[PDB]
Each structure stands twice: as C-alpha cells, then as structure tokens.
Ligand binder design. Structure first.
Ligand SMILES: Cc1cc2nc3c(=O)[nH]c(=O)nc-3n(C[C@H](O)[C@H](O)[C@H](O)COP(=O)(O)OP(=O)(O)OC[C@H]3O[C@@H](n4cnc5c(N)ncnc54)[C@H](O)[C@@H]3O)c2cc1C
Ligand SMILES: Cc1cc2nc3c(=O)[nH]c(=O)nc-3n(C[C@H](O)[C@H](O)[C@H](O)COP(=O)(O)OP(=O)(O)OC[C@H]3O[C@@H](n4cnc5c(N)ncnc54)[C@H](O)[C@@H]3O)c2cc1C
Ligand SMILES: C[C@H](O)CC(=O)CC(=O)CC(=O)c1ccccc1
Ligand SMILES: C[C@H](O)CC(=O)CC(=O)CC(=O)c1ccccc1
Lengths: 460, 461
C-alpha cells in the first residue's frame, strides 16, 4: 500500500485530475476503503474519487502507466469484494452521481457512480422509472453491467434491456460511445459483461411511466413452506407480467405487525407488488395472500420511489456477508424440500434464503441479444448469509456452502452479480461456452492486457 | 434573451467552465427552463449547468461582468418561480448531486444541487438521516437555506439546526467557508436567509441514527372535521417529540383502500409517524387513529428512506401551482370552522389545504440563534392549489386567496419557502423587524450590489 510511484507519471496525473485523492495516511482512508461486504479488508495505494469523465481518463492512464491493479467502485455493493484492492488504485466513481431526465423524450442519462435511490428520485420527479435493483443504496454501475433486475423487471426487463447507450473509458484511455449503432460489439458485451471492458461514466436509459403501485408483504410460518412455495411456483408459471412475488426465508423480524410469539422464528416473508393499476393490483394481491395462513400483513399503495426504498425495514446494517446463488429451470418438490431443510437451519437474524421468479419480459428477449445469460431460467435462489461478528465467519459461510451443494443438481448458471469472493472459477459456467467465447473476443479488442480484472473476469 | 455579450468575456467564461451551457436555440432549452411551478414561463439568455465549485465561481463572475440577472437553481421547487429568469443566466446546480457520508463522524457533505432523495439514499446506507422536506425530488439547496422542515423535525429540528458549515461562492466570486467559527455572521444569515448571500456549493450536516419508523395514513369524512381537527390540535399540544401528525384536506384519491363512495369528495387525509421504537410507535399511532372514523387506513413499518419517498401516491404530477401560507400561534375553534368551509370548496384533485404542527425541537432553539423566524408558532397552514389546465388558473388562485383572507386575522409570519410569485412584499413581515435589519447588514457586507435578488429578497442596508 506504500508503493514507489514515478514522479513524472504522478505529476501528469495531478495536473489532469480535478477530483479528490485519498492516501493511506489520510484520516478518511480506513472509512473510504471499506465496502458493503465487511469481510473484505484491503488497503489500496490510492483512492481517486473521480468527478468527471476526464478524471476517469486520467486515473485509468495513471494506473496503466504505473502498473497499479485497478479496482473500479460505483456503489461498493460487490458480493465478491471487487471494488477495493490491496496495493492498487481504486477508481472510485461515487461522487459522479448526476442524472439528467428528459420528460419529453422519456430518457435519463446517469453517471456511472449513481446510487439507485438517486436515479429513482430523479426519474420519479416525472412519474418515470426504469428497472433496477430493490435496495436503494446499491450502485447503478455494477448492477446494470451485470444485467440488473428488480420490481419492474417482469414487466419491463433487466436494466440492460432499457439501456440505449453508454459512455465508456477503455483501458488505453480512450472515451467511446457504445450503442446499437456505435461500437455495437462493445455495446453487446457491456450489457451483462460487467466492468471487464472499461469504466462506464454515463448510462442512458429509456424510461416508463410508473404511477402508484399496490404492494403487500406478509409472513407465513416456515411449517407451511411446502404449500406456500408450491402455491408460489404454480402461480408464477402463468402469472401476468404485472405481478412480482418473491419469497424470503428468514427469522421473523421483531416488527410490531408480527405477533411477539413469532419474532426470531423461521418464517417465509412474501413480498408482492402489481406493476399497473392499483385497483387491479388489490384484486391480484388478495388472490395470492392466502398461500399459507398470513401474519403481519402490510398492504399499501406506494409511489414507485417508495417501493424502491422499502427493502427492507431493519434496525441494523449487517457488516459481513456471504452469498451462494444459482438459477433453476424448474423448482421440483425435492428441491423445495431441500430449501426448506436448509432454511430451518438459519440461526441468525440477517440471513435470508431468497426465492425469486423472473421470466416475464426478461425471458422474451432472445438469449443472444445481450451478454446476460440464463434469461430462460425463471427461478433464482440466493443463500444470502449476513451477520456481524467475525468470529462467526466459518459458521455462516458453511451454512451457505452446504445449502448450495445440496441444491447443486437442480441449479444452473449463476448471476455474476451474486458471486462471492471465492467464485472466480464460476465465470465460464455462468455465461456458458458460446457467450464466454464471444465475450473473450470483445475483451481481446477493448482490454487486451486485462487491465480491468477486479470483476467476474473474462480473460481476452 | 439574445443580449449581445462581450466575446472575450464569454470565451474566458467558456475556457474556465467545465459544465454544460444551454442556449435558447438548443433542442433542450424549453425543457431545461421549465421549473416545478409550471405557471412560470420565462426565457433565460443562458442556462449554465455547473459541475463543480469552480464552475459556480466562473458563472457568478461571468454574470457580474456581463450584467446578467442571476437565477440560481437547486431542485427547481420555488413556489415563487425564483429559479428561472427572463433574459438573464440560470446558474443551474442540478448536476452537483454528490454526497459524502462519514458513518464514524455521523456527518454528510452534500453539494448544493442535491435532491432530497439522493441525500436520504446516501445517509440511509448507514441508517443515518437528518431532517429535510417530505417530497423526495425537492432540492436540498433552496429548502435548507429557508430553514427546512419535515418528518424528523419535531425530534431533530430544522435542516438548518443540523447544519455545521457551508462552502459558499459570493457575489465578488470569492469562495468562503461559513460556520460557527468562520464568518459566523454569514453562517447565521444563510440558516434561513435564502439564496441572498451567495451560491452554496456544499452543505455539511450532523446526522442521527434513524431506524425503521411506524407510519399510518387514514382519511376522515369532512362531516367529522371539527372533531378530528380539534383532537389533532389538542393532542399535539402535549405530544412526545417522537410523534408527527399532519392533516391534509383534499379530494379523496381514487385508491383501492378507500371506498368508491368517497373518491373525489373532500376528506381529511391524516399522515402520522413515530420517530423512535416501532412497537412504541404502534401504540402511539393506534391511540390517535380514532380521532374520527378512519377509512382507507394504511399502517406500515418503513425504513426512513421509504417514509421520505412516500409523499404522495398519485397518478399525475400537477403542472401548475399556487400557494398561500402562514403560521398560527393557536388554532381556535373559529379558525377551524374557517379551514373546513374553504376545504369543502376544493375543486382540483391535486389541491390540498395542509395543517402542520411543528414545535418540539424546532421551538427549543433560541429565536435569535438563526435567521429562521416563527420558531415559536407551532401551526402552519398552506392553501396549496395545484392543477393542470391554464384556463383554470384564475379559479384555483382565487380559491387559495379567499381562504388566506378568511384566515388572515389568525395568521402571523410566513415561511419564505412557501411564498408565491406575488409575495415579494411579504419579506419584512415574514422575518420581523430585528431579523430583517440584521439580514440587511449581512447583505450590505456580502452582496452589497444585490447580485442575488431572485429569492425572498433582502436588499442591502
Ligand atoms: C443489499 C444489496 C442488494 C442487491 N439487490 C440486487 C437486486 O435487487 N438486483 C440486482 O440485479 N442486483 C442486486 N444486488 C447485486 C448487485 O447488482 C451487485 O452487487 C453490483 O455489482 C453492485 O454494483 P455496485 O456499483 O454497487 O458495486 P461495486 O462493488 O462498486 O462494483 C461491482 C462491480 O462493477 C464494477 N463497476 C461498478 N461501477 C462500474 C462502472 N460504472 N463502470 C465499470 N465498472 C463498474 C466494479 O469494478 C465491480 O466489478 C444487490 C447488492 C446488494 C449489496
Ligand atoms: C412538492 C414540494 C414539496 C415541498 N415540501 C416541503 C417540506 O416538506 N418542507 C419544507 O421545508 N419545504 C418544502 N417545500 C418548499 C421548498 O423548501 C422550497 O420550494 C425550496 O425553495 C425548494 O428548493 P429548491 O432548490 O428545490 O428550489 P429552487 O427553485 O431551485 O430554489 C429556491 C430558492 O433557493 C435558491 N437556491 C437553491 N439552491 C441554492 C444554492 N445551492 N445556493 C444558493 N441559493 C440556492 C434559489 O435561488 C431560489 O431563490 C416543498 C416544495 C415542493 C415544490
Ligand atoms: C441482499 C441480498 O444479498 C440480495 C438481494 O437483495 C437481491 C434480491 O433480493 C432479489 C431481487 O433483486 C428481486 C427481484 C425481483 C423481485 C424481488 C426481488
Ligand atoms: C406540496 C406542497 O406544496 C407543500 C408540502 O407538501 C409541504 C409539507 O407538507 C410540509 C412538511 O414539510 C411536513 C412536515 C412535517 C410533517 C408533514 C409535512
């Protein structure tokens, strides 16, 4: 973390850079180098907080000339810990948070360091939105380059399915635009290929009009898991795109809507919404609320920006996390039993086994149209361990790996954005052989030296 | 609109400025010049979208040299239309949206063009917050320089009560820090004095840990309006600082939680929350919900970021607005009856007659401690007309003025941030004589040429 740098190279960076530099001896260094995954404790040589595209060009050129390992940081949410490095440089985009929204064009342009909640605030000023993840302080940058799904996805696709162009700084310091008609090969690869191809300084999206959404959340005893998960699996196979319904298996939070005698016990938390008219949504949600005996029901009509800010009401932010995730093409009764066995073993309050159903608009995009793999698998399961005390790391980590191995016969692929710091080896199976080959071709062209390799990495 | 500018002074500005200029010939000019009050239709000679403090210094100096009337824009929410001008320059801060948050120091440094939702997203990543307004796409900038109140205010004060310094670009193009120990005279004036003193490029705040919040919204028939409003006034007089409860008199929205038979009829929408433990919140909110017969009750436990994003679930963003507001020291039975008569006339589905109760932490700050007036008046009433069709402007504006004149014996002061385009003349009465005089002296010092006059303006003494 205290490497010898060239004075000419350094000075050239200083003259070109208009942002904020954070060095190891600076008072804000330990706080700045922390990322969401608290298990990742790494000490960069330098954190460069970029404030403009020309700043990113300067930081990229400086790292390449200096031989410093490049971490790129948008919102710092990497489950694999990719947005901080030991001994290298963090090209930190988090001050590049501006968004421009055209109401007449239903378009937004957002800088690559934006948090979802900033982007949603900006488009919802015009009752507009486009799909993104469900936790507002996630980074737009890493989430969109890996695909991006959330509440709007069954109706409007992945984030990348609404992306119309990007501005990107490539490894040789060039600034490029990529779109359907400009460097379309790079445009294909950034839609699902992660940070492998350059630093995205601006994303442009088409937007949709999204008015108030009927939302429900309720909790079922984990004793009713078999019927609840079977109701969910069966219902989602034929459900309108406008319905999204996700199951989180977890210890019940000590919330006042829930009876005190359920607090801290195994439950399924079901969250559902109707993307469409709220009277229709009231009718569609009432029809799924009795998958089991409902407890702690909350029903609300929410601005979409409030739906985005909702996940999840808790009194503590988990410090340490470990995830194991895959897709399923079908969720059999045997897999269902496996999930429920493993869920019964959760013994800490922040851990969830999540069961998502995508499909809808995500699955109608032809599989070769972007770099995002697995569009035809509707189910995602994520063993998301989360806890506080470092002495417990082995125990929580074992829980997630044990569940993943028990399910492994039922799982395929993986979402690159749910990969953990030990899953570098999963990249080829996540994309599959044809996509991975085509991604390697694009890599040979735009990042032939593999300068950007803190990501689910595609070697050229 | 196309004034002749000096070409050397323009190229110097352009070499110095890193942001975007939008001229009247540009495709995006008509959209960029629109502000939230769509009754305001003005045509700047230039919109300069600043990206940094040096951008702001370069735009200020260019305006001063060029003789251009200066509009400053944060999030564009000015009820008086101050963030756009005819024929001058808009120093548009909307791209300066960065927030740094220190969890260890519980401190946030936010740029002056941030929207509230961007700020609350950033602080809530650490479960932290500080008070601000209730609508996410409001600008931080104008709201804080006026004082700034919302759900966290009874517990934690105005936004300005949590402000610890600013970076500010003054009329002469200088960049200053104001705080308790540096230019403290300016620090006092900016905490409530609007944009009078310069362009704030960075605000620094102390933050508070705010976990999930029990929230309730319900609607009462206007037939029970006297009972509900009296219950509310009486309850708030002795209520814990942790309870906030606001009343919005409006047409009932066509939402599925309300019976079809109430839709489009005037009702009281009551919104309440407990800033504190949610089990205590559940107890406190159940105790106030039966002030009348509740309809369309929604109760939820929300992260504070979701409480901030909740107001208000509607299908349409209103285009045209007109507000008349003031404070009350007491809400008598006669004033209540007046509010109810005027609410019963509401025509638009977007209009509301708002009744807010501040007090708590806001009133505990000594009156002379900031430039924000009326801390000791706990009630605010806002007749907030909002609609779509420009041919209706005279009817909606007349409604808000009639209600204001009917209440005027009960009203004192005025929140600068709720003034409309026709209220330039309200500034002295809003601040009071002693505040207005002290502000005039600070004005004489920092903006003696009144370069910043598109605001609730304080001329220099
Ligand atoms: C609480 C939580 C909830 C989540 N929920 C969802 C969800 O609902 N849906 C979903 O799809 N995913 C979700 N995720 C996963 C998420 O998509 C990934 O964590 C994503 O990589 C986070 O992006 P980021 O910018 O915050 O992370 P970072 O750690 O900053 O970056 C992640 C990766 O992207 C690269 N990167 C970031 N910004 C850029 C850029 N502008 N240009 C180039 N490279 C970039 C980094 O180099 C790194 O490889 C969530 C994550 C968290 C922690
Ligand atoms: C829908 C809505 C909801 C509201 N809710 C609340 C509420 O809950 N609580 C509350 O207290 N107020 C609230 N307000 C009123 C709000 O505080 C004022 O409208 C405020 O002036 C808006 O600030 P802005 O930056 O968005 O507006 P702008 O129109 O951009 O600016 C308003 C004024 O401040 C100046 N200004 C803006 N940014 C700066 C800056 N960085 N430096 C110097 N001067 C600047 C402008 O020159 C102008 O005089 C709300 C307003 C709206 C439209
Ligand atoms: C925090 C966890 O590790 C990961 C997540 O939070 C992701 C997640 O919950 C899935 C998700 O995006 C989603 C997508 C559609 C509907 C509901 C939820
Ligand atoms: C939209 C209108 O023009 C103005 C508002 O909406 C402002 C407003 O409601 C006041 C406000 O900040 C508030 C403060 C505390 C509780 C509830 C509301």
């Amino acid at each position: 973390q205290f490497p010898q740098l060239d004075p000419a190279t350094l000075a050239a960076f200083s003259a070109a850079f208009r942002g904020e530099l954070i060095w190891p001896s600076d008072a804000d260094y330990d706080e700045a180098r922390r990322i969401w995954n608290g298990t990742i404790d790494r000490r960069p040589a330098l954190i460069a907080r970029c404030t403009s595209t020309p700043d990113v060009v300067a930081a990229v050129s400086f790292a390449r000339k200096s031989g410093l390992l490049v971490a790129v940081r948008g919102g710092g949410h990497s489950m694999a810990g990719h947005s901080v490095c030991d001994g290298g440089i963090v090209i930190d985009l988090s001050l590049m948070n501006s968004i421009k929204v055209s109401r007449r064009l239903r378009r937004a342009r957002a800088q690559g360091g934006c948090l979802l909640g900033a982007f949603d605030t900006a488009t919802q000023a015009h009752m507009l939105a486009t799909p993104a993840g469900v936790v507002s302080h996630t980074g737009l940058g890493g989430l969109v380059l890996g695909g991006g799904f959330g509440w709007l996805s069954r109706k409007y696709g992945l984030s990348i399915d609404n992306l119309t162009s990007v501005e990107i700084v490539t490894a040789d310091g060039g600034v490029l635009t990529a779109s359907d008609t400009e460097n379309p090969d790079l445009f294909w690869a950034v839609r699902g290929g992660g940070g492998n191809f350059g630093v995205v300084t601006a994303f442009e999206f088409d937007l949709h009009r999204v008015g108030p959404v009927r939302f429900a959340s309720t909790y079922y005893s984990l004793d009713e898991g078999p019927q609840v998960i079977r109701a969910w699996r069966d219902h989602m196979a034929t459900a309108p795109d406008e319905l999204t319904w996700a199951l989180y298996l977890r210890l019940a939070p000590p919330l006042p809507e829930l009876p005190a005698d359920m607090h801290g016990k195994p439950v399924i938390c079901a969250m559902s919404c109707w993307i469409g008219d709220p009277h229709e949504g009231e009718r569609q949600l009432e029809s799924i609320l009795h998958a089991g005996k409902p407890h702690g029901l909350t029903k609300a009509t929410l601005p979409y920006r409030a739906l985005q800010a909702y996940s999840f009401p808790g009194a503590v932010v988990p410090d340490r996390i470990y995830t194991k995730s895959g897709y399923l093409n079908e969720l059999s009764d045997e897999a269902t039993d496996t999930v429920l066995e493993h869920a019964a073993d959760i013994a800490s309050p922040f851990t969830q086994l999540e069961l998502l159903y995508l499909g809808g608009a995500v699955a109608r995009v032809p599989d070769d149209a972007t770099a995002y793999p697995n569009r035809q698998s509707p189910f995602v399961t994520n063993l998301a361990a989360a806890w506080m005390d470092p002495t417990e790391d082995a125990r929580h980590t074992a829980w997630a790996r044990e569940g993943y191995r028990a399910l492994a016969g039922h799982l395929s692929g993986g979402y690159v954005n749910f990969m953990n710091p030990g899953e570098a080896d999963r990249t080829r199976e996540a994309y599959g052989a044809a996509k991975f080959e085509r991604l390697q071709g694009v890599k040979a062209k735009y990042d032939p030296t593999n300068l950007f390799r803190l990501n689910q990495n595609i070697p050229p």
